[PDB]
Design a protein around this nucleic acid. Sequence first.
RNA 1: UAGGAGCUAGCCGUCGAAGGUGGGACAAAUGAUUGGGGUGAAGUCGUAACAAGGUAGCCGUAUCGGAAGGUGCGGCUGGAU
RNA 2: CGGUACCUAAUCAGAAAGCCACGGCUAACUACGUGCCAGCAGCCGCGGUAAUACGUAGGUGGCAAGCGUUAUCCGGAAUUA
RNA 3: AUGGAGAGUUUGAUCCUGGCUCAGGAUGAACGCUGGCGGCGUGCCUAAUACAUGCAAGUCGAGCGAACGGACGAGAAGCUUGCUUCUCUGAUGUUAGCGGCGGACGGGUGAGUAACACGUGGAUAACCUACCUAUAAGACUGGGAUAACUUCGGGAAACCGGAGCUAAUACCGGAUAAUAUUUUGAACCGCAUGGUUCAAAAGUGAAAGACGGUCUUGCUGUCACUUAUAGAUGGAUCCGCGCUGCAUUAGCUAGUUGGUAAGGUAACGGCUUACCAAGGCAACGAUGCAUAGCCGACCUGAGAGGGUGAUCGGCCACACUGGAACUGAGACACGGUCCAGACUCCUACGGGAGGCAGCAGUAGGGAAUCUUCCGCAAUGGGCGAAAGCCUGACGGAGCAACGCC
RNA 4: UAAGGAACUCGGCAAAAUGACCCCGUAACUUCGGGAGAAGGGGUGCUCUUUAGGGUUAACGCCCAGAAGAGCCGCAGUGAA
Lengths: 122, 89, 81, 80
Amino acid sequence: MIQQETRLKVADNSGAREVLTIKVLGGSGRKTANIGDVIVCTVKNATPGGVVKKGDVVKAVIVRTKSGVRRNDGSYIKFDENACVIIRDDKGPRGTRIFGPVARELREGNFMKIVSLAPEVL
Amino acid sequence: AVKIRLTRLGSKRNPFYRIVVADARSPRDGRIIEQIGTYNPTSANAPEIKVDEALALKWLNDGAKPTDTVHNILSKEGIMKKFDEQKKA
Amino acid sequence: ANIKSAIKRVKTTEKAEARNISQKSAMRTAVKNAKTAVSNNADNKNELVSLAVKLVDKAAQSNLIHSNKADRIKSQLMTAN
Amino acid sequence: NDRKVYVGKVVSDKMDKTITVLVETYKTHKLYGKRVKYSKKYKTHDENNSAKLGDIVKIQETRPLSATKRFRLVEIVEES
RNA sequence: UAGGAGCUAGCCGUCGAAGGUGGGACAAAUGAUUGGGGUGAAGUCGUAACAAGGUAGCCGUAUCGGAAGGUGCGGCUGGAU
RNA sequence: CGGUACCUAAUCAGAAAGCCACGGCUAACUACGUGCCAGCAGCCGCGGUAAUACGUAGGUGGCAAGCGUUAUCCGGAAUUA
RNA sequence: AUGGAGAGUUUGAUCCUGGCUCAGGAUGAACGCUGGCGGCGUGCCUAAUACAUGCAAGUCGAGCGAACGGACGAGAAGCUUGCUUCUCUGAUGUUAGCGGCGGACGGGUGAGUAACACGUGGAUAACCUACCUAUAAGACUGGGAUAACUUCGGGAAACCGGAGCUAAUACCGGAUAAUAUUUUGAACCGCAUGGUUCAAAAGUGAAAGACGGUCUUGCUGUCACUUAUAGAUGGAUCCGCGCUGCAUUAGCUAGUUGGUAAGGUAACGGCUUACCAAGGCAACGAUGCAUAGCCGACCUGAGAGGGUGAUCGGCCACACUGGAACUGAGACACGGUCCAGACUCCUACGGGAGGCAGCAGUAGGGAAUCUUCCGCAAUGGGCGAAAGCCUGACGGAGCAACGCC
RNA sequence: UAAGGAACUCGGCAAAAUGACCCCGUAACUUCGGGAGAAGGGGUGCUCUUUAGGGUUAACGCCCAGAAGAGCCGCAGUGAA
């Protein structure tokens, strides 16, 4: 279950360290979201140095929720935390040394870029 | 390291070489077996051997080595091939 | 000058440093079990006054010696001669 | 065929082969050359309580194959 | 079966640059911030001290002072009357 | 590196010289637009209807591949004992 | 010992003190009109900025399974009549590589570098030495393998995957001829620690190829092979000095203070451990901070003598950072593995690494460093008989009152 | 009660979380008393070994332990309150 007013981690090297959410865009009245989606958020802890610094508005994309998913396979993928990653109105991220695992359900997301940028993908 | 060093010297084209055979582990500029004389062996006069001719007993019996031109001029001096006569003695 | 210096390092160390557990493991396992038993004035107590002093020209011709306990380890054993 | 045999003065006590040296010598200057007293020491501990503590001795303390006294001893001489 | 002892396959503790945490230190911008001097006509003040600077007084010294200046108690000459 | 050096001499009175100023000390001349203005301006200047001096000038001065500076040490100045 | 005005050196000026632009020189030099020529010497300061790398270290079938091709003979013509389409030699050459190699140095940098880091001088009972000289053995050797040679799929990829297999100058199964090996009595020296006295038991192989004319081995000469000795050579441990300077840095330190027993350095130790005193260290400013490759180097005060590293020379340390191990005799390696790290590129995702401190220039800059300069021409050396390369060592080509002649 | 974690709300009311004991560590500011339980950490099961005791000591024994390891089990060891 993901909602706004929720603390999300990053897994890139842009200059952020932790964020939380303002919104879950989409449609009028849209509440919640999971992996494969675009959000806005703001940084309550920034990495010293880096581009993106604390107290700043940002967009981002979902990865590897603990509300993992189930596919047309009839089968399931879960994690033990969540994380986000920050973008540049282009499906192009700022930090470019992505850590940790990521899903496969974002090729459709057209972050194939990011997937090639990624470690192991699932 | 170790052959008879025809060592670079001097100002613009003043290659005033020196009789030497550098150490088995040192460079052309470094330490040596022993410096044996002050002459350019490529002198326009001749090989022109002026060395410590009495030192043929030490560096030839331990370590030193000529190269293809001065083994001749040393034993028409009575050193290099003549040290073979000394070893036979 | 980038070359293949990295690929045969292992197999030349397997012709030398693994021969140093082919001929040497007779010492490596001995220091734990076999020589540890031949010591202690045991059933085979100190039989190298004559064993080594016959075999070390013959076949027992090892080359890992140094000093300053009585040897590195063992060469001081022709005491009874 | 000879080595360091200086003279000094013992200080402290314990097992294992004293002599805990304190040599006195001179050191001087450039423009005016005032050669004047200074010292240098080498600590160790008592011989067998043979080295009397406070002993202006011909000093050194034998070659080290363990860990308390430094180098080539000569002979204990005089008490101070 | 090396199975005994063994090392790799397995377990009991080590540091390791690394890695990231934490409080101080230095800074640098400086903050609708902020103290010392100088500086550039000194318009601010009398030429305040230098002719007892118009009244010799002074030195430590309560004292207030936008600024030349002033009043209290212990040593003094660095003074014309 | 050299059909270049050595050489014929081919060659002809030929094919090769600027400084602050023209200021007392700056030796470079007095002048004008110059009237403490412009501005050259090193110790210091000049300049106010008689500028030598600002600007300019033909020469022009101290040496010449010459002309003045910039960071270092010291002469200067043992003004570092 | 040979140097030496200050244009001046305050006030009303007379005078003392004072410090003082400046004018002279040189400088890694450099800033503001190019000339007769030439010549010197030199060389990224900023830019130890990232570094692209090119190229940056290569030498030996004169080691052999030699594979390959292939010399040479080269059946038979395969007949628009000239092949080794054949016999065996299959030499020489990448040799398939297996092996002897170095590669830290010719090359670079001074990052760092508190103490012999070096300058610079000692004592050493603190000795070992692929490449090396000389006196003593021959050129006895396991060849399992081993690429030789074959076999099994994958992904663009990185680069792997399973199955077997010959030679060597590889090395290795078994005996050997050189202080070999450390004990019985054998000496004293620097007490510790050396001194070989004893008798050598103990060293023990091999590398034979290319092989000269021949004796095809003498010594297998070569240039590659096994065994004591020393030694060149280098490094090698123990003391003084600069081995640090500096309290608006002071009280410093706790197996501590570095012998005995176990361990280990060619040597030797608290290097760890069972014992030793709180001791030891001290305003010798220890502690700690700052700093450090070190000397000459130059200029130069009258002499006194000194500050002097850019260069330039010598002597340390580091070579993408770091960490473990391997190692070449020694390596943490200018052009070695695993790596973290870091980014770089690639990605077809399956993962792989790269890797400027050789020397040029690339972005850059500057006042400054030439020119992604020339070639090994010569000399140089590492491996290699012979011969070869590295050359970005070397020498040179341009640069220039930086300074002149 | 998943998951998220004060967005609810006038307002974290409420509830939630804390706690026991042991050990280590606890700043600021101070009317010097304190603050301070500051904070912040870490720990507790069972068995065999003595360690050697608190002695339960009569003494190892009796339990707690001197409190030392070594071991057994589970998601879980002031397992409740």
